[PDB]
Symmetry: D2
Subunit: 78 residues, 4 copies
Amino acid sequence: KAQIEIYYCRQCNWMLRSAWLSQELLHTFSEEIEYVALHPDTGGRFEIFCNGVQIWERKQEGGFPEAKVLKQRVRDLI
Amino acid sequence: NKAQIEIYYCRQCNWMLRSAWLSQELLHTFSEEIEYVALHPDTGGRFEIFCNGVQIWERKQEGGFPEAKVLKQRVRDLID
Amino acid sequence: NKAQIEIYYCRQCNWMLRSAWLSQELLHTFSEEIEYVALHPDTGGRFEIFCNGVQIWERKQEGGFPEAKVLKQRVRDLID
Amino acid sequence: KAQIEIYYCRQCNWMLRSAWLSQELLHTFSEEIEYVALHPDTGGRFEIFCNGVQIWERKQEGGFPEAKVLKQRVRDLIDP
């Protein structure tokens, strides 16, 4: 089962959107997911991993993922 | 040093909502002492929470679900 | 016909989280019988919930916060 | 105070993102907001209103708002 990690900058007030994305994944892949973990992190960081594979990086992407895009990148890995 | 919290909830009992909430309560209160809070979709009737390997909540055992205050406190006692 | 629910929570007591949760519990369970669920940031110590004008929860009165089940039930009795 | 309404398609599984956006606003404008209301709606609808002014329409915008953009559109209509 999939192991998803979400790292978000602790003081950038990004927990909200992280918890949301977390539930979007838990809701859509309730049976293919082992767990979705939220990692409070340091400045400007927002990165998501699926089974060890980075499926999102704020700077790289220049922003935050849409629910649809994230679901899709996760789907392609499971 | 940094707490590891695991939340197991019955996948089909519609308990994700309350699990995600409790997760945010902890992440919000212990934003600096927590390594991560993990949500584990599980099987029938299960709702159990662990902190650094220590079970701090079991639905049957407790006969229900934890209040935000009680859970924070049980986590706090394990973080110091 | 469709229920109107209002949730007043103390703005600075860090109660938005639990309010947003309860709001989603209701929207999820009564997605077809609810007109809307409104969250009202309020003043000190206040946490009160109304359904179609009827108060179904008062923190002091109840001495705490409602369980998802109890709140659903009190709302259900005012719809049905 | 501002009055915000969020209409989302009830069966499109859009409550989640609606509740999130709701909290983003309640958190950022905790003192300038009267209330944020979530309205479960019909097919394909996702529209947001602020003090009677439409600040978002899914088709019109061809998608969903970023937290920053929505905050901004609300701020421009708010009693500064």
